[PDB]
Every structure is written in C-alpha cells, then in structure tokens.
Amino acid sequence: AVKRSTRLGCNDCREINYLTFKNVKKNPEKLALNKFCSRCRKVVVHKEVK
Amino acid sequence: MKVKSAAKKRFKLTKSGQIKRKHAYTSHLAPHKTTKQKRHLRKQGTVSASDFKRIGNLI
Amino acid sequence: EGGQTPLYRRLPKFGNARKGFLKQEWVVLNLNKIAKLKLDKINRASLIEKQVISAKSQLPIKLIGHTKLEKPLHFEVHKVSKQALKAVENANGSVKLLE
RNA sequence: CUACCCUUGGUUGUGUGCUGUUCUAAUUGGUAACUGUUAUCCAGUUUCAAGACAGUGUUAGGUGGGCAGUUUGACUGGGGCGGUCGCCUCCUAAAAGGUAACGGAGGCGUACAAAGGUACCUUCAGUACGGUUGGAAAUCGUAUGUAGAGUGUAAUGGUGUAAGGGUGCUUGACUGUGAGACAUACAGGUCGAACAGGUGAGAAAUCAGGUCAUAGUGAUCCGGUGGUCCAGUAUGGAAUGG
RNA sequence: GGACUGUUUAACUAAAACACAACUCUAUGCCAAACCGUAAGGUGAUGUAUAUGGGGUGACACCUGCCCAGUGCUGGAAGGUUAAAGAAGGAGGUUAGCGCAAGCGAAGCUUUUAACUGAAGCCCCAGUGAACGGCGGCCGUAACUAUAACGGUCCUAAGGUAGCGAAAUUCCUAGUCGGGUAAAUUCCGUCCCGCUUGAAUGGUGUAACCAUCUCUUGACUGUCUCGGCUAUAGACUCGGUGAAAUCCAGGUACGGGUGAAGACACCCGUUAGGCGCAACGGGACGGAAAGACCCCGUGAAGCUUUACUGUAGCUUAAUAUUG
RNA sequence: UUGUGGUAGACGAGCGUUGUAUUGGAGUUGAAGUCAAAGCGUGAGCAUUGGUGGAUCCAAUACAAGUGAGAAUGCCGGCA
RNA sequence: UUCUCGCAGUCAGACAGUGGGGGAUAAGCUUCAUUGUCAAGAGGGGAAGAGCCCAGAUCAUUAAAUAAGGUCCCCAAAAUA
RNA sequence: AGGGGUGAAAUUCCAAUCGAAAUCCGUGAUAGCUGGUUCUCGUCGAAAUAGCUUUAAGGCUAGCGUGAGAUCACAAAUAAG
RNA sequence: UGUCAGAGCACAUUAAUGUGUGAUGGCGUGCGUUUUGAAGUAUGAGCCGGCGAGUUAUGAUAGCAAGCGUUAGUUAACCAGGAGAUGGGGAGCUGUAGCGAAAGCGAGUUUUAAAAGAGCGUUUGUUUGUUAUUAUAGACCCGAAACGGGUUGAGCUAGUC
RNA sequence: CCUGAGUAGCUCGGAAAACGUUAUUUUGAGUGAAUCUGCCCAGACCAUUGGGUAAGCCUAAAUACUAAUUAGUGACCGAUA
RNA sequence: AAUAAAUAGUCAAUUAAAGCAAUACGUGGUGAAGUGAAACAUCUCAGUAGCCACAGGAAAAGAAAACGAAUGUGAUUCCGUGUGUAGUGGCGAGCGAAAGCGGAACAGGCCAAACUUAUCAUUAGAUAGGGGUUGUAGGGCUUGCAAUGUGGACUUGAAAA
User: Fold this and answer.
1) Record: contact C13-B9, CB cut-off 8 A
2) Which one of A2, B20, B39, C82 has the largest count of C-beta atoms within 10 Å of its C-beta?
3) What is the nearest CA distance from B58 to chain C, expressed in angstroms?
4) Total number of domains in chain C
5) Which sign does the torsion angle of CA C40, C45, C49, C55 carry?
6) SS3 for C14-62, per residue?
7) Which residue range is the domain that position C74 belongs to?
C-alpha cells in the first residue's frame, strides 16, 4: 500500500487536527498552513507532523 | 440461562428496547475515509428490525 | 452464523471507566410519582414504613423532577436536581440536604 | 606559590570470578581386604582410584519425525495440475433500472500546494496557404476545421469560450452538524438542501466541506502514541483503567 | 536372473525377493559403546577392539573413474553473533522537609532495563562421497553430412571414467542385421547418439545349482486332430428322513413405441386348454455383499518429513552440593 | 357472496385408552377379553346381538401420559 | 401485494415458447431473462406420455350446454357440393 | 503383551480374525451424511431465486407463505388516459 | 388380480332396493422412501403379534386467561402439618427517569462554543395458569471407521533356555 | 523479659484463586528479614489511617450417604414390563 | 561382631493390624481421551473419568497476623438472595465470583514462650512441676483484696424414665 498522506497538528495547542495528501517528492518541504481550530475556535497555523 | 459475556460488552440497552450498538472501521487509516464518514461514524445506532430477530434471541 | 464471522467479533467493544467499581445506587423521588404518595414531613423513618425503600436497608436519596406540586412539605434528601430544587422551593416546601 | 578538573603510567593495597598447582578434609565407585555371613545382594571399617570433577535438584539454552498431538480451502459440464477468490469500466443484458456465464474486452491495489478553489483573460485537433537553415515531421502568419485536441488513468462517456489552457491570490483539500433522499439481508457504501461559528478567493454578488466521475482498499481481538472537564478499590496520590 | 543348500505373506503369490559366507566402511579402552527401564539394575557380558554394535554390497576372479558445489560428520580458533543470571548505571511514584504558587525533594518501600561479563552453539575455514548424492552446452571443422574423430567459446565443483549397451532398463520398437522359423510383435548374437545404461543406493565374466523363467529339440501321448465306449458315486426311480439362500402382493407371453432414456403387468396388434417331469439356464438389469472401483465429507486411521508446536534422549552455562 | 388442487408449512376445532378423584349403574339371573353376523357415524369411534368366557367393568367431568403403529436393510417371537 | 408479531419452508429444479450466449441457431446439453406448467394439482385431447393444447376437481347423479379435440370400424361421435 | 512383544522381513504373527488383539469404562464419543418417527377433521397455503460463508449435500439473512392486530383508501392491484 | 355392472345359482339378515357367488362387458402398469421426479431394471418391506422413537429439570421469550393493580405483585430460603393446600415468612426483583464511556447531570442528557441541528428521554405494569418456541442440560430414535485409561491372553505361531 | 525463623518475604518456573499467574496464598531452585516499638492485609505499590499479630493443636451442632433392619405407602411396573 | 566399649546384629516377652467390604459418600496424591469450539494447536471436557492410601460414623474444615471500608461482624459449617454480577477468557469458545443480607445451625478451650521449682556431671541443647494461650495487647515478676463460683468440650457408680 502507498502511504504518502500526512497528519497535520497544531504549533500552539499541539494535537493532530487534520490529515492531508502532500507530495513528498515534488515538494517535501514544510507546509505551515492556516486551518480552523476548535480548541482555539479560530483560523490557526497548523503544521505537518511526520 | 446466562448472558453472553462477549456480546454484552458491545451493546447497551435503552428505554423501550432500541439496543444501542457501536460503529466499526475506526482502526487504521483516516485518509481512506472522508470527513463526513469520520464525523458520522462517531455516532452510535440501533440494530434494524430484521437484525432484531437475531438480537433478541441472542440474549 | 453459517460460516460468517459472529457479530461481536465484527464491531468494537465498550469501555467502562467504572471497572472494578460498583456505582452507589440512588433512590430517586420524582415529584409526579410521589404526588400519589400521601406522606408528609418526609424522613427516612417514614419512608421505610411505606416500603418505598426496604426497611432492612439504607440508600442515599436523590430528588428529581420538575413537575410542580401544590403542597408544602419537609424534604430530607442527599442529592437534588436544580430544576427539581426550584420546583420544590417554589411550592413552599422545606428541603434540607443530608450528608 | 595556596589548589582544582581532564590524557595516561607507575603505583601499595581490599573484593569478583577466570585459568594453572596439590589435597582429601565433601563425594562416588561396577579396586581390594575384613565382619554381620555359611549372604559376590546390602550394611559397617580400612585401603585403593579419582575428586571438589563428574554427578544430581532447579533455572536457562542448542541438536533433536528418535517420540507425541494436530494441519494441509473451495470453485470447476466429475478427480487433478490450470485460472480465480477483493474492487472498477464496455458488450453480453433482449431501449426503466437491473440479469448469469470457466462468454466476449481492459485495469486497480493510484496521482496532484496543482492536476483544489476563487477572480480575471483566452479557445480546437487535423488540414490547407506562404516563409532562413528546415525537411514528411521542428515553427510562425492566416484561412479552414465542430472539439476526432485536451481532460493526471483502465473503459464509459460527456467535456465546441467548455469539465481546457494563462495570470494573481489562499489552501473550504473548514469545525459541530444536518432535514432528506439512494442502494440494500446485515455490515456498510453514495449524495446531501440548510444551520451556528470561523475563514479563504474576489470590491463584489457568489464559490470553496477536494480534483468531470466511477476502481484506488482489511472489520474485529490485541498493541502503541498524544490529549482528556473521566475514575484513583478506606483515604491521599500513583500505577493502572476509561 | 540369482552364488548355493535355505526363510518368506498360518489360509492367493515360494520368488529376479530376503537371508546368506565373504567384502568394505563406522563406533566402542571398560563401570565400553549400544539397548531397555524413571532407577537401581540387566544383556552387551560376567564380553574386553582378532569382541560387540551399526551401514551397505551379497560364490569366485578383475576394478570402484571424477566432484567437498550444497548437506551431514570431524577438527579449528581469531572475527561477528549467543541465553538464563549478576549489577555499571538511569528514570519515576508516596511524602518528611524545603518551598507564596509553581516546583525541588533526604530516608523506606517503590519501578525499570541498559555499560560490561555470559557458555555451548550458529555464521566462518579445511578434510571426509566404498558418507546424501550428482557428474553439460554453443560454434567451426571429419569424401556430403544430420552423425562426431577433432579444434575454439560459455557455464559448473566436476560435467559418466571404465565397463556394458533395445538389457527385468529402449517411448519410438514389432529398431536393423544374420540364425531361428515354409511362415516367429517371443528367442539367440550383433550393430553403439545410450528417451531415462553405468561402476559396493556397485559393474562385467562367472563353475555348479534352482518345486526359477523363457525358446528350441529326440521320444512321448485322446492337449489336439475327432470323439466314443466299461464300471461305479450321483444325476432318475422307490421306501425312511430331510434344511438354505431369495421372498410387497400376483392368475408372472410375444414384437413395436413409450418411460427415471434396456417394459410379464403401460398402449397398439399376435398367439397361447390347465397342470407337470427331465435337461439347460436368455431374462426376471439372478443371489450374498446400505460401493469396496472413482469423487465428496472442514471423517477416521496409519506412514514419511527442512509442515507447526512440544518433547524423550544428548550437550552447554549458572546456582546448592563445593572446599 | 367466495367457496371446500395441494407438498413443505401455518392455523383452528375434536376423538380413542389407562390411572386418580369425586356423583352412578350393572354384574354366577354372567363383567371384561376373544372370535363372528347381513349396523350407526365427515372420521377419530360408537354400538347391537350370538356363543367361548368365568369375575370385572362401563357411562359423565378435569388432571397427567412408558398415550394413539405401515414400514426404520426396525427388537423379539411364531409361521409358511 | 402496508407495517409489526409468531411459526416457518426453499436455493440440486426441470420442461415448453420467446430473445439469447456458449456449444455448431449439434445435443432431451449448459448458462441466462421473460411468458405458462409440474413440482405443491387431478382430468379430457395428444396411440399410450409432469411440464404441449383445452382446462383448475366439495361430494351423489343412469341430468343439460359445451372447450380443446374428434365423427368408416375397433370407439360414443355428418353429411352435402 | 499390545503409541507393545515377536518377526532369515512379508506391514509376518500375537487363539480360524491385527498399519496394529480382545475385554470394561470415559461414551449414550461424533455423524453438514443415510434410514425411521405411531389419532380425526376444517381453513389458508410458497420456493428451488439473491447475497454471504474454510463455502457449494450444509449453515446465516432477504423475498416468499401462514397465523393475530391495526391501517382499511391517500395503500395495493384491473382496465382507460 | 380389482372396480362399475351383471345372467344364473343357493339362500334369507342389525328385513333392508338383502346376502354369498359371478358366464360375461367397460375401465384400470402396488406402499412408504429420497429426488426435478419412479408401475420402475433406484432402495427397503415374506407375513403376522406385542413392543418401537419430540419427555423432563431449570430459565427466558411470544400468545390467551386470571389475580392484583399504580410502590403494588411476589417471596428465595426456612418453619408449623397428612408426603397436603394453607399459614408465618418481604430475603430481593421486576414497572414506576433517562442521558452520557463514566464522573456527573437529569423532564433533560450527550456531541458541541451553542439545550444551535441530531440521538434517546419526554413514561407502564407485577405475578401465576395453558400452549408454542428458544437456551443449558446426551435432549426425537438408530448408524461410523475412531482416542485414552484399567485389565486378560506367548496353550496358536515366532524367539531362546 | 516474652508471645509459635529457613518464618515472613525477594527472584527463577509454577498452581489455586471467577482469574489463562494479577493483588493474595503455596513451593521445586537460589536468597532470606523484624520481634510486637513489629508485621500482615485494605486485588501493583507508596504515605496516613483502619483492623488483627500468623509462622502450634483440637472442636459435638446444622452436612452428604444409605449396605441393611422395623412398620407403612405408592394419580410405581404387572411374566415382551 | 569387624572395633575394647559401641553399634549393626541374634533371641526372647507385650501390644496394633496384615485381611474382607456399604457395588453409597470424604480427603490427599496421581491423573486422560473422544468431544464442543462447525475443523484445530488456547481453552472446554475436568480436576471429571480411572488408580492408589487411609478411613469415619460422616469426612474435610474450623476461633481472626478473618475479612473488609463500615457508629461493620466478632469459630466454623449449609441453603437462598446477591446474578448469570463485576470480571476472566484464540477478552473467542466458554468460565464465573465475592462482600452484604435473609435464614439452618452455636463451644470454647488446650501446649511452648517469658520467668520459676526439682531432678539429670547443667558443655542443657535433658526430664518432670506453677505459668498461659492474646491485640478492645496480654502474659511472666512483685505488692493486695474479694471469692469458692459455674460451666461443660468431662470419670466412675446409684436412681429414675
């Protein structure tokens, strides 16, 4: 099975928030994106976790 | 008679029947599932009328 | 099931935090039901005479039910619901919490 | 100079087993002698031989069909090797849907911060005409061409300013849901108005809860990781459990 | 073919089998190995390496070609790898106390396995094939030549050496050839590219011998040509006695068609007085034998094994014996 | 009015026998059992009579069945 | 022919027609869908025939109209051109 | 003396029988496979299809039949459009 | 292998279109069995007589009836007695509030910031009697090759002394 | 001054415990405390607290059971039982 | 005896069976298989079948270092509730408590220990006497008082029924 999806947690409240599909070859760089956080109840910068 | 120990660990009983069951497929991979499926499988349900004939006789 | 996997081993199992722990029971006094009861100046001594609770037993008492009544009485309970507490205090009844 | 922390050696010493010495003073004997006894069994003494070994008790290892208990799926115009067991696309399938075949045709055990979205701009392939190297074929200018182009891909299709290309901006590729439908024996799988909050794209109305779509995935037991407003066997914690 | 005399499945098969003297290999130094039993103990054996035990080939004569690739065994120790167990050490809890909180945190218990030590053994290196066993291709070239005497190439550890070679082995095949035979898919010797021969899981000659097999030959005969008669015991009759398998019930014909596809019972046409006896048995898909031939059963049983898991036995380390 | 094909199978209503228990009766002036004959029944059954027969039954009601025989290569026994 | 409840039963179907596929538009063959039958329901025609045709049987009739189908005889049942 | 003995070896023999004797018990082992299963009557009265299955002889669910209740015409069919 | 009839014959009864019997006419290929199915050349059954295979103990569910009936019903056990009902006996249970993993809360809970929207709640019954079914008990009757344990056989063969 | 030492216990394998090794209890092997100021236990454990001080023994009573005797009974079977 | 003593040993006297079965129960040791799980290696079966040893009128067990979390009882034993509970389990098959209560049924005592007396050579580490059978701590030592006191779990006779 191919496994290249990645979990996305938070850099402030620090829990896994989402799971996305990002290429580990054409752009394996960090993606500190903006998503909704319920524990913050606002748009927060979520960070990919290996 | 005795109550099935294995069975009773997975079904609750509510008022006026309506045996509450659990939801499976929570084991391995979220990416194999969609957001609606993940947010709906958390809710628990009750066996059907056809299933009820196989649940009432079970206990 | 004729070769099909049994239903219990196809679904997850419950988890009980009260494992190895037996929850303390609570005799609940719902206002709608105890309205049928004619007892006044309620205490554990009177309740056992009416067999609402076993005489050779004592259990903590909880108050329950927002169904308003129309008589002031004396309540000696251990637990109480907020809406039930409001219902029994507005009915001019006196309630003393026991512990 | 009053000293300390590191590299290392010499360096007196106390403890630990490792080999190399004897020794029986453990021990054994299927050495011999004597007594019970007239008893080659046995017991006792002495001697002899090793000997703190072997050996036994336990623990932990390796060889170990020598031995023991079990196993070795189904389908198949009968047995058997063949091929398959899951999922998706076309015909079969007879114009609702759907319908079998060990019938006729192919694939999947995915790809992508763009190939999602937003706002804006833009329109074929092929063919033809004319042009340096340069032609059959490099490309441009124009005409023509109904899209046979292209759509991340297997087939189905649709896709003629689109479902495709270019530019800029974010990653709604939202949180909690959800009336309601689909399909169905269960499990499940499909869509989902609309709501609360928060955003993103665009001034905008509107759109965004992934890709034009359908394959693209394994329940459950058990186990691990983080958090938890959960419990803490009398209590207090903790372990541990949820 | 086997050396032989012999043993063999009681009650199908008496041998090309097995055994067999002999040959070869291997282990065992004594309280021997081995074997049995839990263990004393016992055979071996009250033997003592010319004895016992195993493995294989099985008169006698001549040989046993190559290869240690992999395996098994033996030997070797460096190298890596290796348990239980010991503790170098680390972390955490409860809380005395210190602490404004937060937190730090002595001692007791607490919990955890990591430095290092840890054998035997495995990986590693050699020998052992009369130890398992295995022991090739491509191209050019021989008065064609497919052949293969030969020369180059590739692969392997080596590529069956000798011997034999339609054989108990040869599918083709009834191979060819000569003899045999008027005429012989059998037989005798030969031809050597031999599907899949082959040297102790042995090979060739091999004297004699086989209730051994096969072919030919002199004689020999009712085996046959070609069958028949004599006497009995039956078969037949008489007197006595007298059971069995089978058995839904029957008064139980023919041909065609039909059928669950092979009709005494069906329909159509035919014929047959009834009952017997003697032969002989077409049929009643005759009889006993709930298929046993083949298949299935999430059947059983046994057997083999790098199928799994255990485990006897053997071996190694620790610990008490044990200084 | 529909009506009265039907396996599996569903549903409903009844009958037979024994015993217990209460109310009855008969019976050496013959009970049961058995055989027979020329009855009644939708059927489980009910009779009637003749004689063997030589001392037990039947009728009405509930309760409970070692309760209802066409096969089981059915068990035994008897018989061809 | 809706739902619930109780009890089920069946998956080894076959035949005929239609449209087929495979096999050969060979097979009383297989696979299918559809229309009827037997299974689970007899009867008449069909020479006797489970699946063809007519047809769906409470029972008694020595009553009538008939369906398919038939009318020389077996064997009820017509003749004219 | 029987997961034993014996065996010039053949799976030989071990009381006319033996891939391992017989006897009693666990055990009434198990039998998706065979066989059978004993009074009357009335009414209704299918399926041999689908999915799943260490699964094709089996078993589970559906659909179906039947019985009780309700719905009782908006439901369901039959014709016409 | 008999039916529907029926000549004739001999009779005369549970007196009735009677019985027995049938020269002859029409018609007609057994019973269970399992299969899609057998007159079947598919199997079983010779016949006869008895016998011969869905019970029980407990518990639950469903139906019908009853008692009680909105904190009632009901006793397990135990005791008094005729081997008896009965009485004494409330030990406990069910229904009388559920939600949430639980803490906790509760005519609301949980998800959630939100009772937003959704889940359930927002309330009936108890115990016996009959029948049926299911569950534990071998649990309609019968049929395996099988495994272990406890024992006896070497008198038959074999082996040796 | 004393109150039951190879004792409690710790470890290696165990077993009983509903428990398939988990508090607790027992030991085949190793090891091995304190002296009521102490220990055990309050299902790991730790502190406080609670309770009792193992490491000696005995114990009618309700308890299973009839081989039988005595008297009696059987909604027991009646020679196929 | 070898060995002086000494043991081993030899003989003599006394005492318990040794043995049978109640074809029923108990304990302890030992200890299966088929089977179910649709198969099977966990497990179930089952600590059961079976064997042994000992019996007894029953056996085992029994006085809290018992439990266990309560103003909790204060030997043990048995039934029921607790409940098919919590849990345990290829967390599968399956197994399954325990407190608490209602009852059936009551019996509490006895040795070492501390210290002490006497007798053995008092290397006592030997024997016989008070002591006293514990945690609500006690016993031992000593100084005092009050008493003979019930009880049996208990000996002989006598009487009665």
Assistant:
1) yes
2) B20
3) 11
4) 1
5) positive
6) CCCCCCCCCCCCCEEEEHHHHCCCCCCCCCHHHHHHCCCCCCCCCCCEE
7) 26-99
